[PDB]
């Protein structure tokens, strides 16, 4: 069996850098480059302008949209934990767009 | 003298991670968080969809817009080397926006 998981947008993955992360880039990109864009999650909701609270009960369930980073997802050990809700993914993207200007 | 350089958008900085980088985030953000968004530069132009060739003659003068990353600019030693042209900065941002979707 040769096929293996490749992150897709909206995936919540366990990764060694920025442990939970939300994938923003699409499968077509992630499958060809070995990289994906992702946003790290942390524990505490603070009302920080760039945070997005994720539904569910996970320990690290606040995404920090401003700390987006390209990561080499194979080398960092990306394992899929689940997904975020579409509305959460869209709020993350909107906040990054504001930062990029 | 207490004031020190804080990156601003369009700055080309020498940084220890992703050596030359283009700053995308604005001073108001960079000055409060200790972080900025930046894109790494590399040597070779390949026609890669996410590359943006920078004017000038520097060794690492091709920005890889898809490898944007939040960096802790003080800890990575950000020193200003110069600037990129406005049109180059706008092409980088547009390419990141496509990746974010």
């Amino acid at each position: 069996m040769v096929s293996r998981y490749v992150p897709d947008m909206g995936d919540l993955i366990w990764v060694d850098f920025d442990r939970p992360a939300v994938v923003l880039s699409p499968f077509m990109y992630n499958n060809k480059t070995g990289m994906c864009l992702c946003v790290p999650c942390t524990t505490q909701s603070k009302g920080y302008p760039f945070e997005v609270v994720l539904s569910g009960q996970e320990r690290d369930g606040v995404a920090l949209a401003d700390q987006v980073k390209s990561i080499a997802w194979r080398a960092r050990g990306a394992t899929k934990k689940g997904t975020v809700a579409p509305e959460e993914l869209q709020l993350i993207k909107a906040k990054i767009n504001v930062l990029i200007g | 003298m207490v004031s020190r350089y804080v990156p601003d958008m369009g700055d080309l900085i020498w940084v220890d991670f992703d050596r030359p980088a283009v700053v995308l985030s604005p001073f108001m953000y960079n000055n409060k968080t200790g972080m900025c968004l930046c894109v790494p530069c590399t040597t070779q132009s390949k026609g890669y969809p996410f590359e943006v060739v920078l004017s000038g003659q520097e060794r690492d003068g091709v920005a890889l817009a898809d490898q944007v990353k939040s960096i802790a600019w003080r800890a990575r030693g950000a020193t200003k080397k110069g600037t990129v042209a406005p049109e180059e900065l706008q092409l980088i941002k547009a390419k990141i926006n496509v990746l974010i979707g």
């Binding site: 009302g47 920080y48 302008p49 906040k95 504001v98 | 108001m28 953000y29 409060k32």
Partner: peptide, 12 residues
């Protein structure tokens, strides 16, 4: 954009 950065400044 303008609303967002107003709120950011206010937060900090």
């Amino acid at each position: 954009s303008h609303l967002f950065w107003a709120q950011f400044d206010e937060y900090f």
